Each structure stands twice: as C-alpha cells, then as structure tokens.
Design an enzyme around this catalytic site. Structure first.
Site, PDB file in Angstrom:
ATOM      1  N   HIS D 135       0.800  -1.218   0.000  1.00  0.00           N
ATOM      2  CA  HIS D 135       0.000   0.000   0.000  1.00  0.00           C
ATOM      3  C   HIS D 135       0.836   1.272   0.000  1.00  0.00           C
ATOM      4  CE1 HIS D 135      -4.359  -0.918   0.475  1.00  0.00           C
ATOM      5  NE2 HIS D 135      -3.899  -2.107   0.823  1.00  0.00           N
TER       6      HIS D 135
HETATM    7 ZN    ZN Z   1      -5.615  -5.094   3.222  1.00  0.00          ZN
END
Ligand code: ZN
EC number: 3.5.1.98
Lengths: 317, 181, 539, 388
Positions: D135
């Site tokens: 992320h």
């Molecule tokens: Zn996740």
C-alpha cells in the site's frame, strides 16, 4: 468458564494498559551511586497557533507571512489587525487623519487607497465565495468546512445509520436477504431494472438467486448491480448517477473541448428562454424538453430532425 | 451598494471553487497569462478603442490601483487554504533567489475575478465617497465586459489530466496532506 | 422503420424523464459534441437488451484514445523534479512520476466504512490482542536474553583489564539496534530507561549481569502469567470462535421470523410472476406455466418432518386434546393424499392440479423450506459423517488437555453415530424444550462446520407450520376447499376436462381479495410446480 | 514438478509491534516460520536470512526525504515532527512505532534478496514472508504500510527478467504497485479484491493504465462472502489467459490471510484450501515465482495458511495434524491445520463475474550504499532452533 479474577495475574493486568510494576519494581543499583479551536480564517482544523491577548487562532499556512512549524518564531505571536489595534496606529499615533495622508503620500491612489489602508486592518483568511454569487446557482451549497457541494454530492449519512444499524442489515446490503430494497414505499410495486426487465428478488429458500438492485439519485430508476459494471453500492461520496443522464464533462479529441455543462440557473430573470429555430441551431447542448447563457425550448421533433440531418451529413465520410 | 457580474465569469468562479475544494485542483501558477498583462492589454485595447477626452488618466489610475490592491490583497482574502502551501513554496523560492515576488507576475486572472467578486464586502466595510464609489463600480463594469469579450482566449476549459497547459494542475497526495494538515 | 424507431424507443423507455435524457444524449451526439464511442456506450445501457434494435442502430449509423479512469489524476511536471538518488536510467524509464493516488479522492471527501463484525468476532479480535501483547513481550525478552547471554559468554573467558574497557557501538554487536532499547524501555521507567540503556552501552560487564537477572525473572513471571491466562483464553475462545464464524446464523433466529411470513412469500412469488411476464412481453407472447419449482429426490424427509410435527403435538399446551388429535391426523393425511403415499411406513416417528388459498400456499411453502433445509443437511451428511467419524484428534493436546470438551460432557457430541439421525433426535428434544438452545446452536456450529445454519429455528418453523395447518380446518372456506380437493382427487385419468370446473367453482367459492395458487404435482420423478395466476380470471 | 524454494525469514522482523489494538501485526510471520520448521520442511529446502536494506538501497522507488523521515522517525519526538507526518501520512492512519526503520529495511532486503535469487537462477521459488507491503506510495504511507518493497522486488527482477507480473489475491489491494507500474509496458499488475466503500478505493474496470501501460493493469472487484468455487472460477481462466497473452518471465504473488473467511477489515469467505489452490495453480505453470506476505489482520489463521502455501510450494501435502509449537495456544479448539470457512452470504453473482471476465479479456486482447547493489548476499542462517 472465563475467570478474570485469579487468572488475570498481577505482573501484567488487562492489556492495552500498564501497571505499577514498571515504576515500583524499577530500582537499579548497578551504577553504585483566550483561545479558540475553530480557526476563524478558513473554518477548518489542524495545527493551531494563537495570540496571548487575542481569542482568534489561525493555522500555520493561513497567514500573510507563510510560516512552518519547524521554524516558528520565538516569543509572542500577534495578529495583523492586532498590529493595527494593540500596536502602532491605535495606541500611539492615534488614527485622526493617517488614512488621508496615506493618499497624500501614495501619489493619489484614492479610488483604491482606502481598500489598501483597510488591508492591514484585516485578518488574512482563505477565499470565501460571496453570498450574491452563491444565490445565483441554487443547485450548489456550502459544506460543513466550507467546500463545494452541488447536487452531484450525496448528503453525508447520519452516525446512527453509519455505525449502529444492527448486524444483519449492512449499509451496502451485501449480506442476508433484504427484500425491502426491491419494493419502493411510494407505490408498493416492484423495482424493474432498466437493462433486464426483472426484479429478480428470488426466494428465501434460495437466497443465492437474489440480485441486488439500487434506485437512482436523480430519476429513481432501478438498476441491477450486475448489469452495469459496478461491484457494490454507492453510499458515501457523490450521488450515484446512473449511466443514462447527461454527463457533466465529455471529451471529443480534435486539442480537445471539455464543455463542463452550465450547472443550471435559478428561476430569476437570469434564466432567459427564446425558441426561434429548430433545424441547425448549433446550441451546443444545454437544452430541456417541453411538450449570456442562452437556452432553447427544444422538443422531440427538433432533436430527432437535427440528429437525422447530422447522420445524413456525416455518412459520406 | 450593489454590483452585478455576467453569468460566464460567475460560472468560472463556481468552477474554480469546485476545482479547489471538491476536485482538489490548484491553478497552474507558472502560466502564460498573468494579471499584469491582463490589465496592460485591457488598458491598451480601451485606449485604442475610444477617443482621448481625459479618461486615460483615470484609466491608468484605476489599473495601477488594481495592480497594487492585487499585490497587497492576494494573501488576505483570496488564496484558499489548499493554495496557501503553494504560495509558501514560491515565497520560499523567492527568498532563496534574493528577489521580491509580487502576485501580478505569476498569478492568473481567476484570482482577479475572486477579488472582483469579493470587492463589495470591503466597499461596504469602508468609509468612502459616493462619487468615487460609482466611478469604481463603473470601471469594474467596463473591465467585466472587456473580460467577457475575451473570455475564450483567457478562460479556456481544459483538463490537466491530459494537457500540459490547462491553467490548473492536479494536487498531489503529499501537497494535500500538508495543506489540510 | 426510421420514422417508427423513435416511437419504438419511446414505448420501450416508458418513463418520460429517461426519454428526455435519451433525447439530450442524442442531441449531444448531434451537435458534434459526443463521438461514436460515447454514444455507443450510452446505448449499451439504453437499448442494450433489445438486440434487434441495437443491431439496426449499429447498421444504420455505421459503427465499426485512452481510458482515463476516475482515479490516478495526472500530476504536473513541477512535482516530478526531486533528487531521485537511488534511481538509474531503467528505473526512470519504468516508473511514472506524474500519477499518484489518494483514497480521500476515491472517498470524495466522505471517508470509508469498515465491515461490522458480530460481538463474538469483536471479542475474538480483542482476545487476539490479549494473546498478542503477552507473548510479543515474552519473545522480545527472550531475544534480549540470548543477546545478553552471548555477551555473558564472551565475558566469562575474559579478564578484568578488558572488563573495565568494553566500549561497544549501539546494537550490542548484533544486526538489530532497537529491540533491546524497546524492552529495557518497557521494563523500567521512561526517564530511567534512557540512563540504563546508556550505562549498558558504555559500561557493560557490571550492569549487564543484574539487567540479565531482572529480565530473566521478568521472563519467568511473564511466562507464568501467560500460562495462567491461556486456560481462560481457551475456554472463552471455545465458545467465542464458532459463534464468531456464524454470520447469517446469528441473525437467523429473527431473520426466519421476519422472512417466513405470508406477505414476504406473496411478494417473492409475485416478483417472479412480473419478471416472467415482462421478459415474455419483451420476447414472446406465450408465457411459461412453471416458476419456483422444488425437487423431491428423497422420501424419508417427509416422514422426518412428520416426526417433528408429532413431537410438537405432544409438547404444546395451547391447544385442546381433540384439536391436537385432529390436527395430527390432518397433517399426516395431507402427505398421505397430496404426494400419493399410500401409508406412512415410518416406525421411528418419535398431472394433477391443486387450487388453494393463501394459507395453504404459506403452509406448503413452509413445508418446502423445511424440505430444502433437510436436503441441505442430508446431501452433505455422507461427508460430515466421515468427517466426525475420522476426527483425528492430535495426541499432544490430549496430553495437556486443550480439546473442546464442552459438549462432550452432556452428550451433544456426534462421534460414533450418524449425523442425520442425531440431528433428528436433537430437533425432537429442541421442540421438547429441554436442550438449552444456545448449546444446540454451538453443536450445529461445530458439527457441520457452520454450514447447518438453516436448522437453527426448526422449532419455530414447525410451530409456524402447525399454526398454519390449524387454519386449514377452522376456516370454513379452507375446510371446504380441502373437502372439494378430496372430491377432486381420484387417481384416475380425468385431466384436461375437470380442472376447469374446479377453477370456476373455487372462483365462485372464494372472494375477490383472496389469492389462488395453482400447485401442479407430478407423480413421476416426484416433481412439483406452483403457478401464480392472481387475478387473471376475474377480469 | 520438483522445484527448489528459498525461504527468507528474519528473527528480528517479529519484534516490532505497531501499537495496541492494531490490525497490522508482523508477529504472525515468526509463528509461520516456527510452523515451517516444526513441519520438517527444512530437509527439502534451503533457508537464508536477508540482511537489512541501507539508505540508498531503499530509494529505487521512493524519494530521498521519505526514506530520511522513515529512518529518523521515532515515537518519542513525534510532538514537533508534524509538518511531514501528515504529508507522508504517518501517525494519522499509520502510527509511529519503535523499529520502523529496521522493519522497513528488513522487509525490503528480503524482497530484493528473493528477487535477486530468482534472477541469478539458483532457486525457482522465492518466499519472503517477512515483508509483503504493497500500500506504500512514492511519498505516502497507507494501510499500515511504509515501504513498498514489492516494487523494489519487481524492478530487481526487471534488472534480469524482461517481463514481471504481480498478482494480488487479498483484500485491500496494492495501489502503490499499480501506481508504480501504471504507464510501463514490461510490468503487468493483476489484483483480486473487493470494491465499494473500501479502504483503498482504487482499481476500476476502466483502470487499465495510460500511455505505454494501457491495458496492462488487471483489476477484479469482488463482493462480500466469495467462496472457494467462485474464486476458482474467477482465478483460473483469467490467470491462464494472462500467461497465454502477456507471457511473464517472473511472478510476484502477495499471499496473505486478509481474504480469508475470518478477518478484521476483510470481507471474503475463502478457506485455506481456496486461498492455497490458486497458489498451486499459478505455481503449476513452472515459471519462476516470488512470494511475499503482507496481508492478514487475523493471526491464528494466517500462520496456518502461510504454512500451507509453504507446504504446497515444497510439493508436498501437509497433514491435518498440528504439532506442538511455542505458539500452540493461538489455534482453534479443533487444533487442526484447517481455516474453517464461514457461512456468510455469497453475494458475488456468476453473471457479474462473467461480465468482468469478458471486459478483462476485451482489455487484454491488446496485450498479445550502491556498493551492495544487485543484492545476492545473505547470511546463511542455517542454525534455527524454532522446532519444538
Ligand atoms: Zn488489506
């Protein structure tokens, strides 16, 4: 048979916390002896700075001199109109005619000189649209923190609905049988999807045959989640615009033209109507159907006529 | 005291509000056209358009006052909280460049439109002669219609997602983090 | 048919506002604003279903760029210019510096909502952190013990001259530089932690032994506390985890009550009716006469449901004895007549067209729902039976007693016995009201691996079926309908000439507001079909 | 068939906790390694410990000031460190913990060490459970992820391989990797996750990249409660088509228990068999594979499923019997190596998955200091006493 009485131990109690063990049992003998919280310049939140003798607090970036936290000034920090009030031009050198000789010194700039003089006696602040600009477009409104919000933006969901909405009924309705979403309370009939002419409610004995449907935020048109390419519902953010209306901005590469609509006009005298010609008007859209910003009273016949004329014009190419 | 604005520039201002607050799009400050040349072209055009009965002196006075007011008002009532950090970057750059930076060399006409829109709230907030008020509002009307006749070459709708020049740039995640933080 | 295409589109759209939006889209294409691709995409949702109209439009118009999705807006070139020290030419040529994504733009300045978990799952997460913090501190301490033990081992073969001067850099001669700092920060105070780690760093072999002893006794007490907490954790999680795994079954006790009603079933059959009628109106004028069909592959399930009903007769107290006897015989004889079962051959009970009212329809829908639930039980029964029969318990947990013996004490275990028969006796005692309902819930949770979630309210649906069958005789109209079904059923070739009189006589017998249900039953393959003809004959 | 597998585990990667009541937990990797050792898999495996990354060895994707901040960040002096704590987005959604720099260095070093071991050719499958963070953006931290080590592994693979494919199978998909490889042609990004009021919010059917990276980003939005059969139907044909058209030289797989039946912010209904048969299917192609783990907020199921992926990557079938370890109290009352699927509703309809498959096919028919650079240097780490 959970026992948090005797099996909870004494060195480490209920976690996400601490205890007196790290303080009482820590002997080491090895060394052998007025302010506000609303930021009334942009109406937002963040890192704050405030004045000792002023209740107004600002942001670090919401100042005429932009300063940063890493190099904040030492000592007192004191405001611009506070410089005009608590300091010079109001305590010593009392304001008798300083405004007038400011014109007499700045070489006859009198039509803007009073505004330039009032500039220093005014807090630095973020831009705010005036009231008479906002009342012109009724479809737009000011947000909670002062942001743009037209009719494309959905209202925020209440905290009661957002968090405490029981366990079976989810906001996106992705779990359990939910037949109330297929029946509208306006008439009690069934919501027929636009693409497939089926409600597809299914049955309780076979919940897997149930197909999720959603009403439109503009025309209340039902739409299945599988017909349109879409994974889940639209509940936070902008209003769910079904792909059957006029887009706000289109792209026609020719570099290109945007045509970001005209976002509608209130029912005052600014909204002007004049229907004169139906063929070849070249009104670039922005019409309405009937049975400055110029709009025409177009009807089905005129649109269908000019569409046929254009497609018969273009079929040589 | 009342001031009216033609609907095209009102829509431009509303689109600017949407771009900044909602779409998170600050204006392209390194732009081709700035406020100083806007007022220079306005002066030149309305000087060569009409005769010379003595209105050129008040023309020059009005444009000089507008330039000075935009210079000393830009960080006071314009400049959304998103764009404050962008103002900070070029102010720091000018501090490193040992030069004084004034708004009219880099800021576009959208901030001038913002100033025009917010003008009545300070016109009503200051003590000033009525004849000068009428003269100011009138010259505002001529500047508004002149900007209306040149709205296509000066305010063109372009998306920064695919064009190098759109008088607007998309905001980065880090920029938004410092701006709203 | 160019002059009739717009009228056809107007009839197909129906709604006026959608027609106006379609006209706006067509004009947008007409004023050289919308290109061919955007128009084709618009008609993909406008007239996508109508294949003939779409093909005609594509042929007549002449149908034969970048995607630029909603996210990943293009950054200006100003943000591109940063030093990028660790980037070589290939790294510049693979990585795009002007495309950045931020979830707040995806949320449109509204945030995101997380999936809500049941309170059993919430306390399972809570106990996950309870078990995490303890042993995380514990094994960080053991890492520190092994580091200081290596230090002490290096100390044990060295003399006082190098003991006085043993300066070391941060890291204690290891690859990590912050684990030891963290543990001696946690054990002692915040301000004393800095000085103790400082002295440790600059003067070892004097403070290291006492620090090692303190950390070792801290390890001993932490391990004792963890072993004390482990039993509480295990006995709580034994009842927490399987209840947490049940998501639909936790609300099933109320979902079944709210959903197995008259109005919901009428809505769910009328939805299928309008779906079929609209689809055929789109496609072809004749309409099929079959919808919401149930299969009957097993015969013993009827006798099992009869056993459950019989158990319910002898348990309730709100009915009279002649009432109970008449209801029981009627309930048995309905199966004995409708499914052409000559006699109920059970011993361990501890085409033809039918026109019926809404009460009989709800009663039969309840029976079909229970039938399908027991089909779901029985179809995987041959797998779950060998699953619990070959439940290989690990012997190490047998040594120190960690197996879940909560249901084994009172005999709710399924080992050494067929799962379906045990579930039948469990349902019998559940109707009998001496099973402590949540224990039966847990047994069904860890008996068929939470897949038996539809049998949670077997007593509730049995009570609903009994109450609905009670209206078959008390109501004069329903009793007369049943008697005329007795007169109709003769097991003889009399079809296609007698059911019309049946339909006319039940139309005259019932009222305008009453609903009729054509339940067609087939002897071969034991097939059924229910047809919704509500208000198709009184018009 | 038979393939040698390299395992990269660090004894220090589990000693950092993000905070109290935190979803992301690096503690699961250590018991995953303990289960690997306790299963006797070390006889048919070679295991190394990857060295932590340095300052400029961490800069092949992210900016200089971001790495400098991540190295100098510390919870003690977080009070004055506020101007660029919200910028890089650290401390608001990703709180500062001690050992953040060491954890990022260890995860990145493991990632590029697995990539370099794939490149040099000594091993065919690289497993790095110590770090699978996906992320992290260029200068932004999200999803409790700070360093996008998967991008570093992909570019390290690109130093030798012509084409690299990234496969994400868990919820909260990697937006950082797709942002890194949105406009490039030699990298194709494929992901499977849920959409609709979800934490990433990125990844559309129209999101296929721009420029030279057009039609090179595969994104499959799913819904709540997808079981193993429909996940198989949405995995195997699209994966076979990706390998038959794109033809990658290396595969980066982000295994994790985020998409399991039991999860905190997860939404799927995958069992261990459903989560692992997809890995077996992509492994059956025979091309080199990089395996990373950076998903899963649950711990007792994540350890078991990571042990299962390790077992099938060792080309053996693990028994359901669970031997004793020093984290034996985490597992369920049955105490078997079995992640039990839940009974939640499968709202993932077959026709929606079919339409997604068709439009994906219509998109993909067009496919047709730096002294220690290049990695290839690890400690042996053969003396592991994690067996119990
Ligand atoms: Zn996740």
């Amino acid at each position: 048979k959970k026992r948090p009485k005797r099996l909870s131990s004494q060195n480490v109690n209920y976690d996400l916390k601490r205890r007196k063990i790290i303080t009482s049992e820590g002997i080491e003998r090895s060394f052998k002896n007025e302010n506000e919280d609303f930021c009334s310049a942009c109406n937002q939140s963040g890192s704050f700075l405030c004045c000792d003798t002023c209740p107004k607090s600002f942001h670090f970036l919401c100042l005429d001199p932009p300063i940063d936290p890493n190099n904040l000034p030492k000592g007192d920090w004191h405001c611009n109109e506070c410089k005009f009030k608590i300091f010079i031009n109001n305590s010593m050198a009392t304001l008798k005619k300083i405004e007038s000789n400011f014109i007499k010194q700045n070489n006859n700039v009198k039509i803007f000189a009073k505004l330039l003089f009032n500039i220093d006696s005014h807090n630095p602040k973020q831009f705010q649209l005036p009231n008479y600009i906002k009342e012109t477009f009724p479809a737009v409104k000011t947000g909670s923190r002062g942001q743009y919000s037209d009719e494309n933006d959905k209202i925020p969901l209440t905290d009661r609905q957002l968090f405490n909405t029981s366990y079976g009924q989810s906001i996106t309705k992705l779990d359990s049988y939910n037949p109330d979403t297929h029946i509208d309370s306006n008439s009690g009939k069934f919501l027929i999807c636009y693409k497939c002419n089926q409600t597809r409610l299914g049955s309780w004995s076979h919940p897997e045959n149930s197909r999720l449907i959603m009403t439109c935020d503009y025309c209340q048109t039902p739409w299945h989640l599988d017909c349109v390419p879409r994974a889940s519902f639209k509940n936070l953010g902008s209003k769910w615009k079904c792909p059957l209306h006029s887009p706000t901005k289109v792209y026609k590469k020719i570099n290109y033209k945007v045509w970001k609509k005209q976002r509608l006009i209130n029912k005052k005298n600014q909204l002007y109507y004049e229907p004169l010609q139906k063929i070849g008007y070249q009104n670039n859209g922005n019409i309405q159907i009937i049975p400055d910003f110029k709009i025409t009273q177009i009807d089905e016949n005129s649109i269908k006529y000019d569409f046929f004329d254009k497609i018969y014009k273009s079929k040589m190419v | 005291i009342s001031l009216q604005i033609p609907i095209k520039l009102k829509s431009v201002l509303v689109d600017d509000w949407e771009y900044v607050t909602k779409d998170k799009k600050i204006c392209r400050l390194p732009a081709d056209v700035t406020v100083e040349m806007v007022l220079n072209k306005y002066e030149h055009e309305v000087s060569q358009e009409l005769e010379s009965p003595g209105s050129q002196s008040q023309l020059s006075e009005y444009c000089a006052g507008l330039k000075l007011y935009f210079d000393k008002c830009l960080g006071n009532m314009l400049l959304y909280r998103l764009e404050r950090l962008q103002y900070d970057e070029l102010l720091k750059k000018s501090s490193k460049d040992q030069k004084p930076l004034v708004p009219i060399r880099i800021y576009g006409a959208i901030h001038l439109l913002r100033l025009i829109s917010v003008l009545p709230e300070l016109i009503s907030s200051t003590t000033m002669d009525l004849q000068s008020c009428q003269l100011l509002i009138k010259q505002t009307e001529d500047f508004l219609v002149w900007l209306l006749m040149h709205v296509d070459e000066y305010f063109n709708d372009k998306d920064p997602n695919r064009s190098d020049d759109a008088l607007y740039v998309n905001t980065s995640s880090q920029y938004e983090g410092v701006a709203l933080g | 048919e160019e002059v009739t295409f717009f009228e056809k589109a107007k009839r197909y759209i129906g709604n006026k506002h959608l027609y106006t939006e379609f006209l706006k889209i067509l004009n947008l294409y007409s004023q050289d604003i919308l290109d061919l691709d955007d128009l084709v995409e618009k008609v993909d949702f406008y007239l996508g279903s109508n294949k003939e109209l779409f093909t005609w439009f594509k042929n007549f118009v002449g149908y034969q760029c970048e995607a630029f999705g909603p996210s990943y807006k293009r950054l200006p070139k100003s943000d591109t210019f940063m030093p990028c020290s660790g980037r070589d030419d290939m790294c510049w040529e693979v990585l795009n510096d002007e495309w950045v994504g931020h979830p707040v733009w995806a949320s449109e300045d509204s945030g995101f909502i997380a999936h809500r978990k049941n309170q059993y799952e919430e306390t399972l997460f809570k106990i996950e952190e309870e078990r995490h913090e303890y042993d995380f501190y514990i094994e960080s301490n053991l890492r520190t013990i092994q580091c200081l033990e290596t230090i002490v081992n290096k100390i044990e073969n060295m003399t006082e001259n190098e003991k006085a001067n043993f300066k070391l850099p941060p890291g204690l001669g290891h690859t990590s530089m912050t684990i030891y700092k963290k543990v001696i920060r946690k054990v002692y105070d915040k301000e004393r932690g800095f000085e103790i780690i400082d002295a440790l760093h600059e003067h070892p072999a004097v403070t290291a032994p006492v620090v090692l002893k303190r950390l070792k006794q801290k390890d001993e007490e932490w391990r004792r506390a963890q072993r004390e907490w482990n039993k509480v954790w295990r006995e709580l999680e034994q009842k927490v985890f399987f209840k947490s795994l049940d998501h639909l079954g936790l609300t099933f006790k109320q979902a079944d009550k709210k959903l197995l009603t008259t109005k919901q079933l009428i809505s769910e059959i009328s939805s299928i009716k309008v779906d079929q009628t609209n689809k055929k109106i789109h496609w072809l004028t004749p309409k099929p006469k079959s919808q919401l069909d149930f299969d009957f592959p097993d015969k013993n399930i009827f006798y099992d449901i009869l056993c459950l009903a019989d158990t319910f007769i002898t348990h309730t107290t709100a009915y009279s004895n002649p009432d109970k006897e008449r209801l029981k015989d009627l309930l048995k004889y309905f199966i004995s007549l409708f499914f052409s079962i000559s006699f109920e051959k059970i011993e361990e009970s501890l085409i033809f067209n039918l026109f019926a009212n809404t009460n009989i329809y709800i009663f039969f829908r309840h029976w079909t729902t229970i039938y399908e639930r027991l089909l779901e039980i029985k179809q995987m029964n041959e797998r779950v039976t060998k699953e619990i029969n070959t439940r290989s318990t690990v012997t190490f947990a047998k040594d120190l007693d960690l197996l879940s013996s909560q249901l084994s004490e009172m005999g709710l275990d399924f080992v050494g016995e067929d799962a379906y028969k045990q579930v039948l006796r469990l349902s019998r005692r559940l109707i009998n009201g001496d099973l402590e309902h949540q224990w039966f819930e847990e047994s069904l949770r860890q008996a068929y691996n939470n897949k038996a979630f539809k049998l949670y309210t077997i007593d509730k649906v049995t009570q609903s079926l009994v109450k609905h069958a009670h209206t078959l005789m008390t109501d004069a109209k329903t009793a007369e309908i049943m008697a005329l079904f007795v007169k109709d059923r003769n097991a003889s070739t009399t079809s296609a000439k007698d059911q019309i009189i049946y339909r006319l006589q039940v139309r005259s017998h019932m009222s305008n507001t009453e609903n009729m249900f054509r339940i067609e039953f087939d002897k071969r393959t034991l097939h059924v079909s229910i047809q919704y003809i509500a208000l198709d004959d009184l018009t | 068939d038979k393939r040698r597998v390299a395992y990269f585990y660090d004894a220090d990667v589990g000693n950092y906790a993000y905070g109290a009541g935190h979803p992301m937990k690096p503690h699961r990797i250590r018991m995953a390694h303990s289960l690997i050792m306790n299963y006797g898999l070390y006889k048919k495996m070679e295991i190394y410990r990857a060295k932590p990354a340095t300052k400029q060895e961490m800069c092949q994707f992210h900016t200089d000031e971001y790495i400098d901040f991540l190295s100098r960040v510390t919870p003690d002096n977080l009070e004055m460190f506020k101007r660029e704590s919200v910028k890089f987005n650290v401390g608001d959604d990703c709180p500062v913990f001690d050992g953040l720099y060491e954890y990022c260095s260890i995860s990145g070093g493991g990632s590029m060490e697995g990539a370099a071991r794939l490149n040099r050719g000594k091993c065919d499958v690289a497993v790095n459970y110590a770090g699978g963070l996906h992320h992290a953006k260029k200068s932004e931290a999200s999803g409790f992820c700070y360093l996008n080590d998967i991008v570093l592994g992909i570019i390290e693979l690109l130093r030798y391989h012509p084409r690299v494919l990234y496969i994400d199978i868990d919820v909260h998909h990697g937006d950082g990797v797709e942002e890194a490889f949105y406009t490039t042609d030699r990298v194709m990004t494929c992901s499977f996750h849920k959409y609709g009021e979800f934490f990433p919010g990125t990844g559309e059917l129209r999101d296929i990249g721009v420029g030279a990276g057009k039609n090179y980003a595969v994104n499959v939005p799913l819904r709540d409660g997808i079981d193993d059969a429909t996940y198989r139907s949405v995995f195997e044909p699209v994966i076979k088509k990706i390998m038959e058209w794109y033809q990658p030289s290396a595969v980066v797989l982000q295994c994790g228990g985020d998409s399991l039946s039991g999860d905190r912010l997860g939404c799927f209904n995958l069992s261990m068999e459903g989560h692992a048969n997809c890995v077996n299917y992509v492994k059956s192609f025979g091309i080199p594979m990089m395996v990373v783990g950076g998903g899963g907020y649950t711990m007792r199921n994540v350890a078991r499923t990571w042990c299962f992926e390790t077992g099938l990557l060792n080309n053996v079938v693990l028994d359901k019997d669970l031997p004793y370890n020093e984290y034996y109290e985490y597992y369920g009352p049955d105490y078997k190596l079995s992640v039990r699927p839940s009974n939640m509703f499968n709202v993932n309809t077959p026709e929606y998955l079919d339409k997604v498959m068709t439009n994906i096919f219509a998109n993909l028919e067009n496919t047709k200091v730096e002294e220690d650079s290049a990695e290839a240097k690890d400690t042996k780490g053969g003396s592991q006493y994690a067996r119990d």
